[PDB]
Amino acid sequence: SLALSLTADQMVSALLDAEPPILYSSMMGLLTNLADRELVHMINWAKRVPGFVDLTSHDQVHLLECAWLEILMIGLVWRSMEHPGKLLFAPNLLLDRNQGKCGMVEIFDMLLATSSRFRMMNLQGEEFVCLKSIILLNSGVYTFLSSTLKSLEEKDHIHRVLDKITDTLIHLMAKAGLTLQQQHQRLAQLLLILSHIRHMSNKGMEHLVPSYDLLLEMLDA
Amino acid sequence: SLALSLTADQMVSALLDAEPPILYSEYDPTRPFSEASMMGLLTNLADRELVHMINWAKRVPGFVDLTSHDQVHLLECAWLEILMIGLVWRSMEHPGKLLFAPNLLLDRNQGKCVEGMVEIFDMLLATSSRFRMMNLQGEEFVCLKSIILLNSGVYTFLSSTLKSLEEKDHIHRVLDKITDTLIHLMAKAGLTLQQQHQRLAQLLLILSHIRHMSNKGMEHLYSMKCKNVVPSYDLLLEMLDA
């Protein structure tokens, strides 16, 4: 696999080049329309994450099904980082906590706390794209229902690519001048935030969705 | 605080010494189970485990330095993840089965007894299988369990004040200490720097799946109107105070 042969710098370059554009905008009507448009770009992005297209179509879809809302959320948090107290859904749709008032406010608050954490950590764009790719590969990897040799090979492949992204994160940190200790600490801090992003996605899903079949068709096209 | 002064070896020792006991399910013969009776047994067991979890939490270095309020917030967010990771750990050497207790070892098909239970069973079994495939060690397990306790609720402190920022900072420092501890255990076991960082990542990424399982488990516990079976703020506070 070409993905497992990438250096840290090539992995970053490939991920930065794959980044979808920032899109423009009844509040739920506007968010829904925006999310719908974002989804098409997310599929194209996923196909460019090194390692992803090596998987069967079925496994690609499973991964997108599990990760789609976390991916939208982490993008939102990233866009909102420089706007304390506000969520930048789009450049023309910047909302503060009070506008979250319609259990919308609960999720708003969680998103704001994530943005605040990213800001306090001085999260870099290179780190962001790594984390977003981790979400895509990791979120669905533990819920593959299959026990065929193929499924075992797919899971192993995902874990190898995830290891590559870990190596990439550590490289970016060493280059930035962090000590070995600081490198491991920051890697941990970044990965632990992913647990909170999962939580937010689960709560978001309760409040609320692309089907397996819809995602498969979008991937095939 | 003397938690931030511990070496990696003292952190491990303190965590190993804090481990709660393995409890038995009600000696309660009646088999096979109904949906109601299985949930009755799991609920009773979980209730009894909760008291020991609070005693355990109080012995996680750094935890008692936090206000009582923050301690409860953390336990509120983490309790089901902690029960689950314990279950997964106990089940590691029993492929295809969940060891709820030494006298309550269930296979996938017994999950079907409770509607919606089988999906979560399958998730738990997959986690046990991943731990087995990674050859997860006891010292690593206790570190991961303490991370869950300190991490799960840390991002949902409403934090207006300098005090809240000091509490969060303290938690993040203790979490950094547990990370250092995990890496130390790995270096001692002979892993290269690269292998150390990779394994740390692999372990922390499983925590996202444990969160997911907790969230799904919480839904199911509501969905079968067990609403007042999640421990209340007040219950957790009283258990902490005692």
Side-chain angles (χ1 to χ4, degrees):
Chain A
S1 188
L2 66 166
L4 306 187
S5 77
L6 298 183
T7 66
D9 291 333
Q10 286 149 13
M11 177 63 80
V12 168
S13 303
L15 295 179
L16 289 175
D17 290 359
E19 269 299 277
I22 294 162
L23 302 188
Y24 280 71
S25 175
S26 176
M27 195 177 288
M28 196 55 50
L30 292 181
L31 298 182
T32 294
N33 171 270
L34 175 64
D36 273 332
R37 283 180 297 109
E38 285 186 285
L39 194 66
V40 189
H41 289 278
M42 187 194 301
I43 280 44
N44 278 31
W45 162 82
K47 287 182 160 312
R48 297 182 61 183
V49 171
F52 191 76
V53 297
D54 300 329
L55 306 172
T56 59
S57 281
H58 170 68
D59 291 345
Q60 290 175 37
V61 168
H62 177 74
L63 289 184
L64 283 162
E65 223 188 338
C66 296
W68 74 271
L69 184 58
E70 293 183 77
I71 292 154
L72 290 183
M73 283 176 168
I74 200 182
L76 172 60
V77 169
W78 174 249
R79 291 196 296 276
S80 306
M81 222 184 103
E82 307 294 292
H83 299 275
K86 304 176 197 289
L87 293 179
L88 194 150
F89 287 93
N92 62 332
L93 192 65
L94 183 63
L95 304 179
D96 63 55
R97 178 179 198 286
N98 294 153
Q99 289 169 285
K101 286 90 168 59
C102 292
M104 178 160 194
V105 171
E106 170 200 31
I107 293 155
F108 224 92
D109 277 346
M110 291 192 293
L111 292 160
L112 289 172
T114 312
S115 196
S116 292
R117 179 64 182 155
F118 279 5
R119 200 186 312 118
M120 282 304 90
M121 286 183 79
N122 302 318
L123 182 72
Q124 301 296 302
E126 293 89 350
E127 293 174 317
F128 164 72
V129 297
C130 285
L131 289 178
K132 197 171 53 160
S133 295
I134 291 176
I135 291 174
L136 173 68
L137 296 170
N138 188 63
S139 294
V141 74
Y142 313 102
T143 57
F144 286 141
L145 298 178
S146 183
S147 49
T148 63
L149 194 263
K150 183 54 162 167
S151 282
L152 299 169
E153 198 190 350
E154 299 272 282
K155 279 186 282 190
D156 197 58
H157 179 69
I158 290 163
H159 286 301
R160 289 191 294 252
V161 179
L162 284 168
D163 285 349
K164 195 90 195 140
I165 304 167
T166 299
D167 293 347
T168 303
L169 277 168
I170 292 285
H171 178 82
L172 291 166
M173 295 172 200
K175 272 178 98 188
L178 284 62
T179 67
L180 269 301
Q181 188 183 43
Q182 288 177 319
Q183 286 166 41
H184 74 229
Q185 289 178 0
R186 185 181 178 80
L187 171 67
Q189 288 159 12
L190 292 178
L191 299 176
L192 286 179
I193 296 159
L194 300 188
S195 177
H196 176 65
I197 296 177
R198 190 72 99 127
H199 183 67
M200 291 196 294
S201 174
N202 294 326
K203 295 294 197 160
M205 216 69 93
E206 282 187 357
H207 282 275
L208 285 191
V209 177
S211 160
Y212 179 82
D213 285 337
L214 174 52
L215 293 172
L216 184 61
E217 176 82 332
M218 285 176 87
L219 226 45
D220 143 301
Chain B
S1 188
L2 67 82
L4 299 182
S5 327
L6 298 185
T7 67
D9 287 332
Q10 286 164 338
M11 178 64 80
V12 175
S13 305
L15 294 181
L16 288 175
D17 289 0
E19 269 298 278
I22 291 167
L23 302 189
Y24 291 87
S25 174
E26 297 172 73
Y27 179 71
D28 269 28
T30 210
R31 296 186 83 155
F33 304 114
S34 66
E35 172 166 85
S37 86
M38 193 177 284
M39 281 301 313
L41 291 178
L42 296 182
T43 294
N44 172 269
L45 175 65
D47 273 335
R48 282 183 292 111
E49 286 185 287
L50 277 158
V51 190
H52 297 284
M53 184 194 300
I54 278 48
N55 293 350
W56 162 82
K58 286 191 282 172
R59 298 183 60 183
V60 171
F63 191 76
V64 298
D65 301 330
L66 304 172
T67 57
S68 285
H69 180 64
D70 290 342
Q71 291 174 37
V72 177
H73 178 75
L74 289 183
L75 283 163
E76 224 168 8
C77 296
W79 74 271
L80 186 57
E81 291 185 79
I82 293 154
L83 289 186
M84 282 176 166
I85 199 181
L87 171 62
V88 169
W89 174 249
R90 291 194 297 276
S91 306
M92 223 181 105
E93 268 26 287
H94 299 275
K97 306 199 163 214
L98 293 177
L99 195 152
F100 287 93
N103 62 330
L104 193 66
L105 184 63
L106 303 178
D107 62 56
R108 173 180 201 283
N109 276 24
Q110 288 169 286
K112 292 179 149 179
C113 192
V114 178
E115 138 66 66
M117 170 78 74
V118 72
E119 27 270 33
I120 294 153
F121 227 92
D122 279 343
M123 293 181 77
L124 292 159
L125 288 174
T127 314
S128 196
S129 169
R130 177 67 181 154
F131 279 5
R132 200 167 41 246
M133 160 170 61
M134 286 185 76
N135 195 36
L136 182 72
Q137 302 294 300
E139 295 90 347
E140 293 172 320
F141 164 73
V142 299
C143 286
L144 287 179
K145 199 170 54 157
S146 297
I147 289 175
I148 291 175
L149 175 66
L150 295 173
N151 187 65
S152 294
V154 71
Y155 311 104
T156 57
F157 291 152
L158 301 83
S159 306
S160 341
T161 62
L162 283 181
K163 179 54 179 179
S164 69
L165 299 170
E166 192 170 24
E167 294 274 281
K168 276 192 183 164
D169 200 57
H170 178 71
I171 290 162
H172 287 302
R173 295 201 206 100
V174 179
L175 283 167
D176 285 348
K177 182 64 90 189
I178 305 167
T179 300
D180 293 349
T181 303
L182 275 172
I183 291 287
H184 178 81
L185 291 164
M186 294 177 200
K188 274 315 95 200
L191 296 183
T192 66
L193 266 303
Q194 183 181 33
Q195 289 174 324
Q196 286 167 43
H197 301 144
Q198 290 178 177
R199 186 180 177 81
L200 174 65
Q202 288 156 12
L203 292 181
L204 300 178
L205 287 181
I206 295 160
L207 300 192
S208 161
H209 176 65
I210 296 174
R211 189 71 136 275
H212 185 62
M213 289 195 295
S214 174
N215 292 150
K216 292 289 169 190
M218 215 68 96
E219 281 168 40
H220 180 266
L221 177 163
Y222 291 122
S223 82
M224 295 181 150
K225 276 71 63 180
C226 319
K227 196 267 139 284
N228 280 8
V229 182
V230 300
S232 63
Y233 187 99
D234 310 28
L235 172 49
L236 295 170
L237 188 61
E238 285 286 356
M239 283 188 270
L240 280 167
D241 286 348

